[PDB]
Please model this.
Amino acid sequence: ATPHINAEMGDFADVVLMPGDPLRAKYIAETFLEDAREVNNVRGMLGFTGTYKGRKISVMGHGVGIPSCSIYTKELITDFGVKKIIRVGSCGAVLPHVKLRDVVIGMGACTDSKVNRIRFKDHDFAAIADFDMVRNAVDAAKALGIDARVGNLFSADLFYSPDGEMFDVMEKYGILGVEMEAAGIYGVAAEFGAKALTICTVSDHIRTHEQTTAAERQTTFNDMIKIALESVLLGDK
Amino acid sequence: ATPHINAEMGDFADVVLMPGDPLRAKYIAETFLEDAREVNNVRGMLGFTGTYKGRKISVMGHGVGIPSCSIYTKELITDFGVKKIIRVGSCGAVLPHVKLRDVVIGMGACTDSKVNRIRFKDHDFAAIADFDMVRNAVDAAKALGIDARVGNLFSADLFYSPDGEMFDVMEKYGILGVEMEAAGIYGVAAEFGAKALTICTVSDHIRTHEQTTAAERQTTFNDMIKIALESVLLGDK
Amino acid sequence: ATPHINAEMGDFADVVLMPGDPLRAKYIAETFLEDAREVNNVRGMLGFTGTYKGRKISVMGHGVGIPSCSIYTKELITDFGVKKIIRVGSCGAVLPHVKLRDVVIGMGACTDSKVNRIRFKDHDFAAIADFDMVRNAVDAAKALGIDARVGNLFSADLFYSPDGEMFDVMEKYGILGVEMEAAGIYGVAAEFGAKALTICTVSDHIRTHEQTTAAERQTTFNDMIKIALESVLLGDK
Amino acid sequence: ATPHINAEMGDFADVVLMPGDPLRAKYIAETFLEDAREVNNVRGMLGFTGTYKGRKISVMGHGVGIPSCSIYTKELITDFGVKKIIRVGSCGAVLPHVKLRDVVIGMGACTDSKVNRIRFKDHDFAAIADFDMVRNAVDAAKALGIDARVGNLFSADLFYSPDGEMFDVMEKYGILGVEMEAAGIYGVAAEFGAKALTICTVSDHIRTHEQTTAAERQTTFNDMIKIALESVLLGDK
Amino acid sequence: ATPHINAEMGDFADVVLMPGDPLRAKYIAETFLEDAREVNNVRGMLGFTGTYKGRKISVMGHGVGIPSCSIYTKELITDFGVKKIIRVGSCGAVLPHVKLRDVVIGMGACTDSKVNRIRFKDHDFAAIADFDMVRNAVDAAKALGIDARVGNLFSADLFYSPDGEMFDVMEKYGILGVEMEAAGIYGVAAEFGAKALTICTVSDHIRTHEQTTAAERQTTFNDMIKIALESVLLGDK
Amino acid sequence: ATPHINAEMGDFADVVLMPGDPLRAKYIAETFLEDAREVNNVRGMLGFTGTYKGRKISVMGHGVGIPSCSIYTKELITDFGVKKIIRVGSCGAVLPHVKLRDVVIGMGACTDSKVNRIRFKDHDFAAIADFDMVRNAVDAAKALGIDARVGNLFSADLFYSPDGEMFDVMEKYGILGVEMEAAGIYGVAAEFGAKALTICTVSDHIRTHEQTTAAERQTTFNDMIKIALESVLLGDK
Ligand SMILES: Cc1ncnc2c1ncn2[C@@H]1O[C@H]([C@H](C)O)[C@@H](O)[C@H]1O
Ligand SMILES: Cc1ncnc2c1ncn2[C@@H]1O[C@H]([C@H](C)O)[C@@H](O)[C@H]1O
Ligand SMILES: Cc1ncnc2c1ncn2[C@@H]1O[C@H]([C@H](C)O)[C@@H](O)[C@H]1O
Ligand SMILES: Cc1ncnc2c1ncn2[C@@H]1O[C@H]([C@H](C)O)[C@@H](O)[C@H]1O
Ligand SMILES: Cc1ncnc2c1ncn2[C@@H]1O[C@H]([C@H](C)O)[C@@H](O)[C@H]1O
Ligand SMILES: Cc1ncnc2c1ncn2[C@@H]1O[C@H]([C@H](C)O)[C@@H](O)[C@H]1O
Model:
């Protein structure tokens, strides 16, 4: 039992899927996992552990922003023996060729947060995902006939940034998606010796927003979820 | 209707109490407000609006960390016309004379986050509360026979900080409590021309943790809540 | 005695009013203090001790800038037993609604300086005044039929700054006035465990571009001193 | 031609291998390329063009340090149509489990340099390699019966640094190797829209304190070059 | 007349000697200048203009700290036709072989102030003296038979620095004297287009703690004055 | 023998002239030194030792960029008894009155590199040349009838800077030449206890874009060489 997770060692699987702000952990568990049991309820942050094709897997949200996900990912790693963390959420795009509903894999994550500088003696720590997890996600996506773009994400501290010019800079440097967690999670993974990966589905254009109906949402979200789950089975092979 | 608040202008009162990680908005509304109606449900972030001694007041959680509360406080201010925001939560203490269950008023909030430097051309922005709100809280506390200490809080980005030496620095400079939101909220209030105040109840010692039973928790939490609500009535006078 | 103050313990009261201009200190002592005696003249930084309505009080200039006032306030606190430093100065206006001859109280002080970062491990230290001293000042002002605005001041290192764009940033975030010492004094007070407050009269509006010239300006300046002196009396009671 | 490269469009292939040591470039061309011709000699930074298994390939030194390699990679990309820069160098080991003669692939590169901050508005830019080039390299290594570790490299500005405490920080956060160019090259690739990858052989273990001397060391160095060359062939297919 | 100097174009010579202490400027005028006339007394910052062997010369205090002297030097340069500023101050020694009353000439000035970073886009501006002025001072000292070291000074914002270790770093890099103005003055000279030089007399030793002592005290503060005045004549020839 | 120099104590003179281009070091040795003998060829960084009017002198390239020259200058100072380093390089002019082939002497060197901040606890280290060396060079130039400006150089990390505006700031502060090594060399000289000086020949103009031209080209690159060599003899006397 930790300060924010009311569970015990063994309650969570070695692999944890963490739903972004959209997806719900309860939805993932009852739709993709079999024999799911509830392992956490603190702050309504429902956690679940079940199996996917015989493989043990847990699911639990990470909350909005670096400070929030940093809490949970740290405790899962040091107190519940979790080895892999896969975040599945949404992101905004700044690149014209990146479209609404595209799946983006964050091999790296830029940020305007100060958490990584505090850890790295104020130098540049390249917040990156585990390579194998990236390749598993990409391969699982190809197997499902889904084209997944791999590159940098940008984890912002302020959803409502005062500096609108930064989005242009992001576009110039190839950032595929803007979210608020990746860099924080990768920082924790490196700090405590674990592996992590962030997968996002473009929910909107920070430029010229398109128009995909609610029917064209849960269908793409299920895709990202399958990618995540299937990528885990590939990693075991 | 905003990106994270599914409500319309008028749904929230001009004054909003935002519960810290402990307290629940639903609890506050059904225990201290009369005729409360639900005004928000997005992401299970329940919002409520009712009255306290005839005074219109809304309550809704802000989530963990600066990035999270920055979202909600900004939208409440610019899209729902909110003028005052009062955060009520818990904090850790570094000072020996500051005890478990003491009420602390954050006239100012230090931080290791970069959000205020991004707003203030990388200079030092003194993240402060509205003076009148501070004095109202203090006076309301005296009226209830509660001694409230006023000073600096510290809003950390990392609950699990790699630099343990910083707590000593905090103690040396008189920080009364460690939390993760104040500086973020004060930053938003100043950016969009509103007023804000953070009130915390010491939940633990980052030094030698005491032992206050669960009976010695909800009793102090109710105190902080009353302080907050009564401080609003004083502000109207 | 120290290299900058040629006096001995006891020569100063436990409360010291400090204007930037040393000649202003002589003006204060001759105008409001009874039985005032000069207690320092090193570097021409005149210091005086006398009584106001029977209360022992000292007044001494602190010079221009954070580095200057930092030396004097520090020595006053650690070598002369001073417990309170009120600074009485002038500030430049940035907000259009802050008019000439307006009394401003600095609950907090933003800054250009790196002194607080040096003290606070390169993080954001919210440089604040002592709460009770601020409240005492507002009440003293009220009793004198004067409206006092409480908020943020900005302590600049460069009176003649090359970045003219900073003034708009200051206005956006509600800075009430621009001066050059508050943040330094508040840093010292916290570092050495004392209490401080900065009170200013607006002598110029950087907006409409206008300084001062009138018997009314000198009236407002005296009102600030009266607020300072009376506030210490309220503090004792 | 430019002030640093005396060649014309066409003289270089669209893919360039780049070791730090210009004499190493001559070694590569003579050992693995057929019909190799010297295409640059300015400042002694030898460049060569030939073919590997019928594929046009170029190889040129980039000199020591981020500032040096930044000029060459930039010119190669904007003036000679180069689309891929693979760097083949040596790195110092920080992790005890990373042994001598180990092939390291830099998916990301941390750094001491301020170049990416200059480019990215003083924020954290995650300097990463191109995903497909990394994957191509791992597969080429696999086909050659070689284990390749993929992760973070650290690009230092000072080979002789005064802060010896940084090496422990590097180890804690899992840096696989220390070199001096990766982050600079990755910054250039992103700024000018090209693709890059850095591959290194561990020539020394800063831990147990040991460099190299053996026919086995030269064997591993050749294996890295073979991995680089074969990986570009896989990239075309 | 400027905001801090009540004088008129022509009241000052084109070269001004400036100690931090206004009273020292008074001593210099009465002891080394003929027909000395006071030209300023605002804020007690005494300024004088006279003759030295026929050369029109001025001497005026600049106060303590970069912010203070920045104001005076600036106004003198933009409104009184001042071409050369020669600071004649005191400094704290950090090196073992430097003793009280030793004369140091600062061709460069390090600092922990942020003023030059604000002027130089946050990069490193090498705050240096005018070369010819340094050479004139070195020559004048030789002809006078007075020893003098030439090198880097360190301009501190905090006389009472909370970072004791920094003195070791200063010693390591050969800092000759610790004062509080040089870097600022050099910054102003470069920004407003004039020439400046700082000459200091070791006022005390930071390691041994031996402050000024014996009649020898000011006697060397005479040496630096003579060197400054004679350097001016040399510069004219 | 050091990691980058295959030579032995005694192979180098106590003073070394260092251009960035190894081939230029070769030209200098063959054109100005008698009995020139190659003493290093590692990484192609040609080093030579010979005689100039009887004085033993060495000349060796240091490569492009602060990181590169930091390595060579350091090793020469700690393992080959080198007391003086004289960089003889090229630079880009930013001021209108500075033309191609003008000789500049850098008594100071600004920079956007982070190396000195890493050495100086993140404060501003004034990277300066040895005063006597500057004076020797100025005198040697006078006797040679060669014009030469003395002032600040700017050592850039990025030749292809993404920040064009910075050149305007450089111009404003009187930067005489933009190169890429001076600040680093000065940092090394101070850290390891030696003396250094940088002399540059305007290689081109950043505003007009006129790079090297006419036979006059290297002819002035001869002027700086003559000045450097003659300055050494002057320094010996
Ligand atoms: C454009 C944009 N900017 C910032 N965060 C974004 C975003 N688009 C999607 N997100 C993701 O959704 C949540 C935010 C709070 O809406 C967060 O959970 C976040 O990861
Ligand atoms: C010691 C300590 N450190 C950081 N946050 C603390 C804290 N004590 C209480 N908090 C508050 O409770 C939540 C954290 C996430 O537990 C957050 O909501 C926070 O405001
Ligand atoms: C507009 C403006 N900018 C900067 N400082 C200002 C100011 N208006 C007033 N001050 C105050 O007066 C002094 C400066 C030196 O003149 C200082 O003591 C300072 O506190
Ligand atoms: C331990 C260690 N530290 C720094 N750089 C190192 C290193 N081990 C190898 N390198 C690589 O080799 C070059 C340095 C110049 O010798 C550089 O090209 C660099 O990439
Ligand atoms: C040890 C030490 N540290 C900092 N400044 C010092 C010093 N010793 C002398 N000075 C110089 O004298 C003044 C200080 C405030 O006494 C200042 O004007 C300053 O330039
Ligand atoms: C315009 C400009 N900017 C930066 N460096 C410049 C320059 N003009 C000349 N240099 C000097 O020559 C080398 C550069 C890489 O060509 C480097 O060795 C450098 O010192």
Summary: The first strand of chain E starts at residue 15 and ends at 18. Residues C 20, 64, 89-92, 156, 159, 178-181, 204, 206; E 3, 71 surround TAL (ligand 3) (CB under 6 Å). Residues 102 and 147 of chain E are 8 Å apart (CA to CA). Strands of chain E lie at 15-18, 34-40, 47-52, 55-60, 84-93, 103-111, 149-155, 177-179, 195-205.
